[PDB]
Amino acid sequence: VSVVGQEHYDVATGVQQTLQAYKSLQDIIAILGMDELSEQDKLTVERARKIQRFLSQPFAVAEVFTGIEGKLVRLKDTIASFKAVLEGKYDHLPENAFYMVGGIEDVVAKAEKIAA
Amino acid sequence: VSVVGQEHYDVATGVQQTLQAYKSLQDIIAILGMDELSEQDKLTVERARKIQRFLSQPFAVAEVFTGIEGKLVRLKDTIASFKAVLEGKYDHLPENAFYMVGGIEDVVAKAEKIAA
Amino acid sequence: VSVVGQEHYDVATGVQQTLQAYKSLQDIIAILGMDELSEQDKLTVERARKIQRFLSQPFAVAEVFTGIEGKLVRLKDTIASFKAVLEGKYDHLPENAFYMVGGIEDVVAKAEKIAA
Amino acid sequence: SSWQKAGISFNKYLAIAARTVQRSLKNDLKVAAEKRYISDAKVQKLEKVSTTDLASN
Amino acid sequence: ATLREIETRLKSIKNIEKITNTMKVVASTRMGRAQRAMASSRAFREGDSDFFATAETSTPETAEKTLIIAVSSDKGLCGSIHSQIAKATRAKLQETPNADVVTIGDKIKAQMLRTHSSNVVLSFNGVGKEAPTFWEASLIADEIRKLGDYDKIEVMYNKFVSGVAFEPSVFPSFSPISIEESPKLSEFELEEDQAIPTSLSQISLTNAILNAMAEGYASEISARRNAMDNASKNAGEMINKYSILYNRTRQAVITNELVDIITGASS
Amino acid sequence: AINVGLSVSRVGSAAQVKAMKQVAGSLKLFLAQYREVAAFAQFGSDLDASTKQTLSRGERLTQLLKQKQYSPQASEEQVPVIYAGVNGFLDNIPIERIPEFEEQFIAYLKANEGDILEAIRTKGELSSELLDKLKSATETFVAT
Amino acid sequence: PMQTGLKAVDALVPIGRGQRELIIGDRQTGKTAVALDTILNQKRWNDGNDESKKLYCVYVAVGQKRSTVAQLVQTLEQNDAMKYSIVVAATASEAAPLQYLAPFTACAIAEWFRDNGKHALIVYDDLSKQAVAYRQLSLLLRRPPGREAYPGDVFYLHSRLLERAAKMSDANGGGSLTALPVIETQGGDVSAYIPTNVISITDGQIFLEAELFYKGIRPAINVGLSVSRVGSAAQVKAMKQVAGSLKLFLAQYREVAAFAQFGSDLDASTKQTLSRGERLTQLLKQKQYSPQ
Amino acid sequence: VRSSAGAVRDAGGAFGKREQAEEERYFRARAKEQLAALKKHHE
Amino acid sequence: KVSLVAPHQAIFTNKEVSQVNLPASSGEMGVLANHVPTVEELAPGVVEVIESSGTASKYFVSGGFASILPGSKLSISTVEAHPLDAFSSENIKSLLAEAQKNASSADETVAAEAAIEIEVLEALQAAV
Numbered sequence A, B, C: 001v002s003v004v005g006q007e008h009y010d011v012a013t014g015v016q017q018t019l020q021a022y023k024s025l026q027d028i029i030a031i032l033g034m035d036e037l038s039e040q041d042k043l044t045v046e047r048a049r050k051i052q053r054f055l056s057q058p059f060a061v062a063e064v065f066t067g068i069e070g071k072l073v074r075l076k077d078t079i080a081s082f083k084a085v086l087e088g089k090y091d092h093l094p095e096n097a098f099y100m101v102g103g104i105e106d107v108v109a110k111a112e113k114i115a116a
Numbered sequence D: 001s002s003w004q005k006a007g008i009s010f011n012k013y014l015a016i017a018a019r020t021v022q023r024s025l026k027n028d029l030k031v032a033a034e035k036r037y038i039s040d041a042k043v044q045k046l047e048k049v050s051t052t053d054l055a056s057n
Numbered sequence E: 001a002t003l004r005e006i007e008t009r010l011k012s013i014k015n016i017e018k019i020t021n022t023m024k025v026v027a028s029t030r031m032g033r034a035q036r037a038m039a040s041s042r043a044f045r046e047g048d049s050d051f052f053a054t055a056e057t058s059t060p061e062t063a064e065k066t067l068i069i070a071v072s073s074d075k076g077l078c079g080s081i082h083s084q085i086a087k088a089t090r091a092k093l094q095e096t097p098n099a100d101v102v103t104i105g106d107k108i109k110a111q112m113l114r115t116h117s118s119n120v121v122l123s124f125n126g127v128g129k130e131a132p133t134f135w136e137a138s139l140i141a142d143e144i145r146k147l148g149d150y151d152k153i154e155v156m157y158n159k160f161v162s163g164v165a166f167e168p169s170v171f172p173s174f175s176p177i178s179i180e181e182s183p184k185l186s187e188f189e190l191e192e193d194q195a196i197p198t199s200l201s202q203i204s205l206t207n208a209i210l211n212a213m214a215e216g217y218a219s220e221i222s223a224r225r226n227a228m229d230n231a232s233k234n235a236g237e238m239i240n241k242y243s244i245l246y247n248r249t250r251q252a253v254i255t256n257e258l259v260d261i262i263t264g265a266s267s
Numbered sequence F: 001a002i003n004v005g006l007s008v009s010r011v012g013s014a015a016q017v018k019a020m021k022q023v024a025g026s027l028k029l030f031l032a033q034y035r036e037v038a039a040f041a042q043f044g045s046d047l048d049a050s051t052k053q054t055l056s057r058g059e060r061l062t063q064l065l066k067q068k069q070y071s072p073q074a075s076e077e078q079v080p081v082i083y084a085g086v087n088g089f090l091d092n093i094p095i096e097r098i099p100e101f102e103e104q105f106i107a108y109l110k111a112n113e114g115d116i117l118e119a120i121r122t123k124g125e126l127s128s129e130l131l132d133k134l135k136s137a138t139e140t141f142v143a144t
Numbered sequence G: 001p002m003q004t005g006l007k008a009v010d011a012l013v014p015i016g017r018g019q020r021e022l023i024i025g026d027r028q029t030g031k032t033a034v035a036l037d038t039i040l041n042q043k044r045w046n047d048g049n050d051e052s053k054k055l056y057c058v059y060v061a062v063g064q065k066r067s068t069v070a071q072l073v074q075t076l077e078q079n080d081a082m083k084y085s086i087v088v089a090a091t092a093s094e095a096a097p098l099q100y101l102a103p104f105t106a107c108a109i110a111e112w113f114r115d116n117g118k119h120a121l122i123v124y125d126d127l128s129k130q131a132v133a134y135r136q137l138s139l140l141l142r143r144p145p146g147r148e149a150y151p152g153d154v155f156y157l158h159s160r161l162l163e164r165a166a167k168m169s170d171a172n173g174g175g176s177l178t179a180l181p182v183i184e185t186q187g188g189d190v191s192a193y194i195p196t197n198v199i200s201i202t203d204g205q206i207f208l209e210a211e212l213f214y215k216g217i218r219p220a221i222n223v224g225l226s227v228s229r230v231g232s233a234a235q236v237k238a239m240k241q242v243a244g245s246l247k248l249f250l251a252q253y254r255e256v257a258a259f260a261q262f263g264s265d266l267d268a269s270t271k272q273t274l275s276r277g278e279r280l281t282q283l284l285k286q287k288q289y290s291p292q
Numbered sequence H: 001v002r003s004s005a006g007a008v009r010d011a012g013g014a015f016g017k018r019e020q021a022e023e024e025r026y027f028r029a030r031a032k033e034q035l036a037a038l039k040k041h042h043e
Numbered sequence I: 001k002v003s004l005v006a007p008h009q010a011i012f013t014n015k016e017v018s019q020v021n022l023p024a025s026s027g028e029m030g031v032l033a034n035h036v037p038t039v040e041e042l043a044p045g046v047v048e049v050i051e052s053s054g055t056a057s058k059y060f061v062s063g064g065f066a067s068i069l070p071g072s073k074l075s076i077s078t079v080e081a082h083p084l085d086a087f088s089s090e091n092i093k094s095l096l097a098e099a100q101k102n103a104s105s106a107d108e109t110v111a112a113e114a115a116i117e118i119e120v121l122e123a124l125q126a127a128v
């Protein structure tokens, strides 16, 4: 928090805590299923899947293997997009709208084109 | 049965059979729950938890880590207390009255003081 | 098909497909019965029981354990008997007429002598 | 018949008449019949998520 | 990922596969006995309740909100049993959120408290263990906290449309003021001096609750058999993948231990 | 990340001060009870009215003990923070305000009731007079 | 037929004269208990006059301590069983050459009775202690090692001493020799280095688990893991009639034993197999030093 | 393949932690009903 | 054409009957080929259904509501419907003797429930 600030330190701790809870409970998700969870464990599993695909951006050198354009997100745009998805502002969007995209601007444009 | 007697041989075999049967029934409760247990399986789960905590007594050299005083039980008091709990004479008592106690005299005094 | 011919490759593929479908459907027949199926599933299940016992012929050295004579079926007689049972020429025969037999001539003599 | 003299409705009157006729018939023919007249269900009225005294029977 | 960690994971996965396979075989035997109770309840809904179809009994305007009754179970491990019942009751409560909810199970009351905790007015536990009978449906209808003072009374449950899947259906229940105001209600020789309007309305609530509990129990038992078979099949694929990793780790442990004794003896 | 169920000390309570051992005498037992009750919230159980006080006090005690880098505390500031979290005085506060409550409680005890902070560092213990003064100052400081 | 005295050994895996029955198991699970009960049960035939029915025991204690060898010899003398039983004392406090040659020295003394017209029974206790003594002398003699810190002749050292205990024909004298090697496993793993070599060379192995010994099975003998290669050819005709029907009922009750926790959902065929399978397993449980 | 006597609690993973939390939650609820009934019977 | 469907099994189910006489609350009325719509309450009597000739099956109904439709349909919905040969004469005397002694002996609904059980047991024992 002394090099990246107080805003960037809270977003990094919140994103890592959601991914660690879904990975430890994978033995009940792959055996019993996703219906064996409670009300609090169900919302954390859906947000962890969308946060893992949003961090994977398509590079400019891998345009021939993926087919999409290269996305270069800045440091200020990446911290604002991760904090809004963890607060409940992007819970109605699908999980495929954030895969292979940029920041918060590319996630809203991909969800509107897939629903048309 | 020829060194400790016929009375001490039945108490050692009965305590080992109840502790070994609780390990097989604990695996079904983690996937199905407590609804699969009948009347005999429900009483065996409560008797196995109180018998494991009754054998753990506070040592005299470990008084700085536990806090309580050291208790020393004799050979005749330990065989009489284990045979009465396996028959159904201490089924109404809780599991906290036998934890960190001595023989049959310390288990009855801890149950009346915790309820007041 | 390039070592045994086109005729032997078609008979081996048809017998392996009927035996694989009947083995995987054994878990559903024990929980849903034998009459809760379609028209195509009922005809394939009746032919798979007789085809599994037709390939088990009695050897010449094992006549003192089963009581039946030793049958030595050739390569041309085994391919002609398996192709006629899969086409519907032996659908009216019993399931016990093909057990402990070898060849197409042994199935016709055992079925006519079982009833009369 | 006697539904106006008692405080029970038509739902409770049908269960009391069927249970009495089953116990007054053949005693040996009571196989798989005593479970329909005995239940261990409970009822508890909630308010606001607290509830009052839970009843039995 | 050593030898002791692979043995504990393989032994624990084998015990879960045996418990899942035994639960699926026990669910197949209980589904046969439950089929007779579900088939008997369907005959009562078409014979005893046939007077409402010939008289055209329907509701009209709302009178002091309404009343909802969610029939479910108290145990889990049944797949999407509690998720399908809570999603059907939440969609119909959008146009009338002032109505009360009467949960008849621990699974339906837990999901409804996270969205509409103020709408829950009745909670009944202990009904999903054994089979439903006429004594359990008659006791919940008489103690529903004024059930006859509502215009519309719905019974949310799960209807087993097939022997593998199910769907969440709903059945309405008329009150005493709506049974006597039907179109062809005067065609039957009914006594107006005795209790005929209030008796036919109270008997329909216990009859519909017995049919919804019998259909919901058969649908929950059928859904539990599919979840137990999927858990047993998923455990077999995980045990096969763990066996390949344990076989490679056992061969690598023997080669690493033999290389350490050969290096020290040659120096 | 210090695991209470794995890390232990062979010296026991003899290598600690008498002031921290009196206000936090049940700190080792509260960590084992709060770990078993935290896993029950992810199963669907919402009952247990008697276990609501222990489940709420275990979450506030773990966040208050987590300090930042290069921010060590003395024996006088750690004895007042452990007494308000073990006696139930921090159960009525929020979980997000656990960081701001530690700085506000240490600043008010250095300018108003400075005699209680100097007695816990010089003597290193708390008798009957020190226990009554610390409990009354912690209850009145919770209401702003 | 080799009368062992146990009800679960004489009906399931029945051992005969001339075969090699392994006694696998973990620590304190019924390893030496099966070998001691079989040697003490031969008092009904050795005290008579029939020389073909008697069987001289040959307990070869290798790897045990000094207190374990004195306690086993005192129990056999009180029941009149030490007069016709050879005792090969080989403690672990001696050299490595004395413990490794204990299996070869005990087999040569017991072979004199089989070559004359009598029967013998060797009990190599244990097979795991004999393999550690042979690898200690080979590592100090400047030799290359192999798997699990053993020499190249690891499989040939145990197969050569176990193949000599066979049943001769009528032209050689008519004698036989039994080999009862106890394989001390680690933690129930029967597919180890020294465990797999002794099970593949012997004609049968008796497994002993530590979970069945604490439940009530005395001794813990798994019917689904222990089997005999001789079958019913080396048994009595009176006991073979009752062992045929009990083998099918014990195998079907083991696979359907998971339905015992739900007794309220049993059918007609499920209730008959559970009641008959529980009474057959409890009747074969015998006490210590109480052979039938 | 065999020897699965208590392998769920001996692992210490997801199934091991859920078994200990389920047994501790059921024993804590039953102890409150047993302590309240014993105090009322003594007076 | 009858529809005697109970809450356990189906008796008539399909329309394949002629005449049926069931004891109602007013009197012992019997339905013919196409009875009029007279849906009345059924009392605890005997519900016999004549099958063409003399193949009638006496079914002792526990009471219900004999509903008749206008399209030649008779729906006799009852709680319990058992035959006359499924009851014993020795076991029926124990329930009738216990209900008479318990009547007018206590309060609440104990005395009111004993009067209804004594009247239903006396009518079934007289039709043997």
Ligand SMILES: Nc1ncnc2c1ncn2[C@@H]1O[C@H](COP(=O)(O)OP(=O)(O)OP(=O)(O)O)[C@@H](O)[C@H]1O
Binding pocket: G026, G027, G028, G029, G030, G031, G032, G033, G034, G217, G218, G219, G220, G286, G287, G288
């Ligand atoms: N069937 C049985 N019933 C009762 N007790 C038994 C039985 N089998 C063995 N025991 C007990 O087990 C103890 C050890 O038996 P045994 O000598 O066969 O094994 P062990 O050689 O001690 O095993 P280890 O070498 O691993 O220590 C004996 O003291 C005996 O009392």
Ligand SMILES: [Mg+2]
Binding pocket: G031, G032, G125
């Ligand atoms: Mg031994």
